[PDB]
Amino acid sequence: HLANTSAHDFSYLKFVYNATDTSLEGSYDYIVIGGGTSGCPLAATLSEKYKVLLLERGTIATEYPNTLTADGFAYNLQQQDDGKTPVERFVSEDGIDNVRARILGGTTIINAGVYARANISFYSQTGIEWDLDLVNKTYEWVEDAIVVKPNNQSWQSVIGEGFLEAGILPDNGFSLDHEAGTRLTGSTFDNNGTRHAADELLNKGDPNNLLVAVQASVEKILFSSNNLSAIGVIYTDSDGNSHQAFVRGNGEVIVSAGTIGTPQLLLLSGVGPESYLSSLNITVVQPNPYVGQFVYDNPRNFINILPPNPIEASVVTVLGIRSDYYQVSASSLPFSTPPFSLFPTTSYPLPNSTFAHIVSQVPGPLSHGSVTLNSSSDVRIAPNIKFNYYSNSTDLANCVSGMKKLGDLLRTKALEPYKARDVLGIDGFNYLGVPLPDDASFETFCLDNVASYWHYHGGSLVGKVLDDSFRVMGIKALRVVDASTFPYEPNSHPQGFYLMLGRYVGLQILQERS
């Protein structure tokens, strides 16, 4: 149930149109906002039976060829953000550099390619009445299209031997499942280095029913006057002109604009906390105190070693999983322009030689913050976001445990060949940045050297904004499907879950209607 090596399939471009085209305006059965990780499979799925309009603010990935290879991963983060690029830069109010996607295919067009299924306990933990058999068939539908078993990479094999030696057991071999132990997982880079992404799932939609508008910046959700319902959207094109599209009958608008874009759009449309919106003189359409609340970013903490002999660059494929920390490492060429957000600030030393980035992820996390509007009218102006890293002490204690484990990993035989000096301790490695340092000093290391893992989620939670069917409570014909919906990560690497979730919810909408 896995995909082959092949070129990125752009056949779907035959139904992709510039949002300047006013013939796109009119009535549809479904409008999907955000052509990303969840939105692309969701729109393709709905188009099997119904007329779908998919609206995406970014352009097409062919415009930026470095999004199409493993080799280009760094380039897209190094590229300056001119407002059109696939990578949009931002800084949380915590002061931590970060990025989100602005491109058809969403974050699967810019990410590190790691594919994994949700922790199988995640479903009962949510309390949603999942159709579990359907979930697994949907995973296979995604995997058959874009996931492969990766080939060996020498550094990934080193790191896998070290995880095992350091006691991250058992050895799970090759597996897509999020389970304790060390494993090789799937990748959306194929064995030729070609990137596969959510946009390619548009190829599974019906070309007679699915229309895609790019450089369509959705500014407002439109509602009925009465029985409050969503009825359509306002979006502007790359020239600045405005356009309207509607749903009809028993159809629906679904927001799939991401952790950041979905709460932003809901607020701008008057769905959010009564007090906050009134203070901005935004008319309240549906008061809900949780829109933009419970927004999470799992911490990344890391060390960099500079081996005395060169190592080969590699994409992450080998995972070391415990309940309280998830670990990986990438080996990378040197660079003199930093990939934005790889390190938490722009003033961070640059590597002269090949290096290994060795990393630990805090699960959850338990610390949370919020998304608030910067402009009360302009969707192209980025919202304020704060994550409050390490405000919850359980997160800190887990970073401490993870950092001690990376210490054990640096002490393994597998890693010994990468020390500069053949001494007994780990100060035999050459480090880029702060090395590992008791308890109080690991806490200070965790707090001072944290970065984003880029796996941020929340802001429109099931049980706070949405019901168990992803419907916005109080409003008919409006749903939200993307990473804004859950308060905890489904696994170490969540694109698999959100690719699946797009199609799954699409199938649930088709079922309800039928």
Ligand SMILES: Cc1cc2nc3c(=O)[nH]c(=O)nc-3n(C[C@H](O)[C@H](O)[C@H](O)COP(=O)(O)OP(=O)(O)OC[C@H]3O[C@@H](n4cnc5c(N)ncnc54)[C@H](O)[C@@H]3O)c2cc1C
């Ligand atoms: C650099 C990076 C590396 C990552 N690496 C990995 C990894 O290796 N493995 C992994 O599993 N996960 C990884 N992730 C995380 C994972 O890819 C994301 O969590 C997930 O893809 C986000 O899903 P989404 O649908 O919520 O968002 P997106 O995929 O970003 O979808 C949102 C889309 O909506 C569009 N949009 C937003 N606002 C509007 C609007 N107003 N009008 C129209 N369109 C709009 C956006 O441009 C975007 O295309 C990575 C994340 C980043 C940032």
Ligand SMILES: *[C@@H]1O[C@H](CO)[C@@H](O)[C@H](O)[C@H]1NC(C)=O
């Ligand atoms: C591998 O990638 C190269 C470079 O992008 C491409 O020219 C070639 O056709 C690919 N191989 C296969 C078998 O698709």
Ligand SMILES: *[C@@H]1O[C@H](CO)[C@@H](O)[C@H](O)[C@H]1NC(C)=O
């Ligand atoms: C859409 O058309 C405008 C010209 O009106 C152009 O500047 C823009 O690049 C086009 N976008 C795409 C994705 O073709």
Ligand SMILES: *[C@@H]1O[C@H](CO)[C@@H](O)[C@H](O)[C@H]1NC(C)=O
């Ligand atoms: C779904 O697949 C997982 C493996 O990813 C397996 O553990 C589980 O038993 C399957 N569930 C069902 C309902 O078949």
Ligand SMILES: *[C@@H]1O[C@H](CO)[C@@H](O)[C@H](O)[C@H]1NC(C)=O
């Ligand atoms: C990688 O594992 C492969 C499995 O395809 C096997 O052929 C071989 O033992 C390994 N190859 C290298 C180059 O180490």
Ligand SMILES: *[C@@H]1O[C@H](CO)[C@@H](O)[C@H](O)[C@H]1NC(C)=O
């Ligand atoms: C909202 O409008 C009132 C006038 O109706 C004004 O007094 C108040 O300052 C406005 N607040 C903002 C934030 O625009």
Ligand SMILES: *[C@@H]1O[C@H](CO)[C@@H](O)[C@H](O)[C@H]1NC(C)=O
């Ligand atoms: C999987 O999820 C369950 C329940 O949420 C949790 O107890 C367990 O720690 C998780 N397993 C891993 C390997 O993260």
Ligand SMILES: *[C@@H]1O[C@H](CO)[C@@H](O)[C@H](O)[C@H]1NC(C)=O
């Ligand atoms: C908008 O963003 C700017 C610059 O990022 C920030 O300094 C400012 O406080 C924000 N304004 C509001 C009203 O949130």
Ligand SMILES: *[C@@H]1O[C@H](CO)[C@@H](O)[C@H](O)[C@H]1NC(C)=O
């Ligand atoms: C951390 O989060 C837990 C679980 O959500 C919560 O009960 C607790 O209040 C938080 N602890 C601190 C110290 O903030």
Ligand SMILES: CC1(C)OCc2cc(C=O)ccc2O1
């Ligand atoms: C774990 C992580 C973040 O994954 C991807 C990655 C890529 C580069 C390329 O420059 C460098 C380091 C790195 O580490």
